[PDB]
């Protein structure tokens, strides 16, 4: 997986993989972008006691890390409203969200 | 490869692969979406004696097939303005362009 579409996400332990980059929703509740073995970006949500966190691209454009209850602990703060969005891990190392769809076959 | 970013393209012979689907910039200058061995969408640009064609997603949102001397033979007609866009060959066999970017990093 290198992309997320509307209301898709990463469960604890799941990742987006494009070598040498991995975007991992970790067990410690931190969302971390690794470049080879080095962390280059994090959501800074790594909190003892917080397990079962998930990162979800919402259908309003917002990318959110939720804790096990439903508390939003980090967001991209990209609410644009109704649309079709995708989040992509690119091979230039950036994770980016595009929307809304402008063409299709 | 399943995506093209800005001023990335498929040159002659190149393709996006998400099994069982292929988006191929063929040597006959036709840009064709295959579902297994069946063409389900084409640019219809195998013209008589055209070769070395390329399909490039541009920074204005337009997706264009060019001949070897840079004449535009087909376009998506999806110009939305200067920004950042991606074309995705999706798991459901749809090819779609999203953009412009709303978040990154
Ligand atoms: Na998807």
The enclosing domain of A71 has a CATH number of 2.90.10.10
Helix H, strand E, coil C: the string for A4-56 is: EECCEEECCCCEEEECCEEEEECCCCCEEEEECCEEEEECCCCCCCCCCCEEE
Among A22, A69, A77, A35, smallest CA distance to A50 is for A69
Measured CA to CA in angstroms, residue B72 lies from B28, B55, B66, B77 at distances of: 15, 10, 4, 12
CB contact under 8 A, B102 and A98: yes
What's the domain range around B99? 1-105
Q: What is the rounded CA–CA span in Å between residue B71 and residue B65?
A: 8
**Which among B2, B61, B101 has CB closest to A96?**
B101
**How was this entry determined?**
X-ray
Token pair 């362009």 is found at: B97
Report how many domains make up chain B: 1
Supply A56's token pair.
């979800």
CB contact under 8 A, B3 and A101: no
Order of all β-strands in the sheet with A15-18: A15-18, A21-25, A31-35, A38-42
Supply A15's token pair.
């990742």
CA of A38 to the centre of ligand 1 (A): 27
- For chain B, the first-to-last Cα distance in angstroms comes to 21
Pairing of strands B15-18, B21-25: antiparallel
Among A45, A50, A48, A19, smallest CA distance to A32 is for A45
Residue count of chain A: 105
Contacts of B95 in chain A (CB under 8 A): 104-105
Among B35, B92, B45, B94, smallest CA distance to B71 is for B45
The C-alpha angle B41, B74, B88, rounded to 5 degrees, equals 55
Supply A88's token pair.
């992509």
Q: Which helix (H) or strand (E) holds A101?
A: strand A101-104
Q: What is the rounded CA–CA span in Å between residue B28 and residue A9?
A: 40
* Nearest chain A alpha carbon to B104: A96
Give the CA radius of gyration of chain A: 13
Pairing of strands A101-104, A95-98: unpaired
Is B35 an interface residue toward A (CB < 8 Å)?
no
Is B75 an interface residue toward A (CB < 8 Å)?
no
Q: What is the rounded CA–CA span in Å between residue B59 and residue B3?
A: 15
CB contact under 8 A, B103 and A3: no
Residues A36/A20, Cβ–Cβ less than 8 Å: yes
Token pair 């994090």 is found at: A42
Q: What is the rounded CA–CA span in Å between residue A44 and residue A29?
A: 9
Contacts of A84 in chain B (CB under 8 A): 96, 98
Q: What is the rounded CA–CA span in Å between residue B60 and residue A62?
A: 24
């Amino acid at each position: 997986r290198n992309i997320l579409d509307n209301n898709e996400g990463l469960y604890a332990g799941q990742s987006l993989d494009v070598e040498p980059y991995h975007f991992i929703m970790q067990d410690d509740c931190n969302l971390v972008l690794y470049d080879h073995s080095t962390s280059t970006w994090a959501s800074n949500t790594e909190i003892g006691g917080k397990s079962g966190c998930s990162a979800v691209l919402q259908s309003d454009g917002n990318f959110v890390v939720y804790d096990s209850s439903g508390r939003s602990l980090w967001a991209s703060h990209s609410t644009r409203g109704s649309g079709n969005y995708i989040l992509i891990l690119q091979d230039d190392g950036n994770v980016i969200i595009y929307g809304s769809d402008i063409w299709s076959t």
